[PDB]
């Protein structure tokens, strides 16, 4: 994780127009000074520079009254400006730099302005990058005045969400979401195929009926034509036994009426022979070998011609149209089943994600609860306390509550915490998370305001131990807290401005027992 190398104020609250550079130990730095030395405005500075639009939380009546209103010896500032410098040699910030520098400036008409590493940035870019570096998750690591009370009135449902962040389930939620995209696509496709199958299946059945009519029209057509060739082979045998004597009548009846109609008998005859010279040989022989009797053939032809007139109209495209629509039918039935299997598969995957997600949540949730127990016993010896999941089966729709028991005292949920018990509990929680997933820094202004000495000593020890992996910036006036800091920054007021001096254990001792009279 990154960490604050220093902080610069120009024109900010109680600090003058002079730029002010506040350097920070990588571990435990302690801001100390008397009531109203303005030591706490440094906390407010940090919230200001992290894009805090909080107004009340920066303890200015309005956004513009974060600006030096002027003092006896210095003119009012033209604006308020804070620059914060992070060491990024670990690349917690998605920036290919080891120093990420964020400067924010607010003008008297309320407008702000940001910069990372000198280029103008918008607020959503500063915010999204501070999130990527998990700087201040829900601001749990920024504990300003009144935050403990805000955290105690906090609902269980409001408490879980920070555990989600810490556990890091977002990566599973990104996968799940693309899985649900593909599932959505999968069944709209699937629904398209269903609508195509319904029409195609109905079109196919028109075509089955037309196909079959076209087929029997075909059969009738063919029988009708062989019968036509049949009636015709007979039609000359008869006409052949006719002219055998129908022109033999000539040399018997004499005045050439018999020459004319026997030239008719020969004139119909000739051509109803040559007519079959033009019929195919396969047809002519698949009939040359069946019946005769001419008038039954003409009655039967008249019939066959009639039931052809029945079926009409027929659509002969149907015979080929059928095949094509049936292939389309069988393929839609094929596609559907593959779509439907694809859908089921996506569903199984989406269920794998949720259960992975939940496991990561519970593993995180249980680690922190173990930690929470220990540390609270450490701050209130002989005591214990418990994190409680509201919905053990679907944690993501439940809240998360706390219950504590101080040694020989009554079990209370966080709702009903009041004295410094409220504070020691809030700090067990905070430290529980910090041992699982250290934030880059923690900011503690006051929080010792309501603990006795024996308490503040264990907190300072706890802070001192944890600083081996996290940065601690504690704004205090209690000597025991001062005692373990690696660095002490002093903050005092002369003639209406605040000043910061890089101090010393016993110097700070002196100044903070002289001011206590």
Author numbering: 1 to 254, 907 to 1169
Question: From the publication, what sentences describe this entry?
Answer:
Multi-subunit SMC complexes control chromosome superstructure and promote chromosome disjunction, conceivably by actively translocating along DNA double helices. SMC subunits comprise an ABC ATPase “head” and a “hinge” dimerization domain connected by a 49 nm coiled-coil “arm. The heads undergo ATP-dependent engagement and disengagement to drive SMC action on the chromosome. Here, we elucidate the architecture of prokaryotic Smc dimers by high-throughput cysteine cross-linking and crystallography.
To understand how the Smc joint connects to the Smc head at the end of the Smc rod, we next solved the structure of PySmcHd-CC80, a Pyrococcus yayanosii Smc head attached to a long coiled coil that includes the Smc joint. Based on sequence and structure comparison, we mapped the Bs Smc cross-linking efficiencies onto PySmcHd-CC80 (right). Remarkably, these residues form a straight line on the surface of the molecule, the presumptive 2-fold symmetry axis of the Smc rod. We then manually aligned two PySmcHd-CC80 molecules aiming to minimize the distance between all cross-linkable residues. The resulting Smc rod fragment shows an intimate association between the two PySmcHd-CC80 monomers with little steric clashes. While the Cα-Cα distance is relatively large (>20 Å) for some residues, indicating that the model of the PySmcHd-CC80 dimer is not a perfect representation of the structure of native Bs Smc-ScpAB, overall there is excellent alignment of most pairs of experimentally identified Bs Smc axial residues.
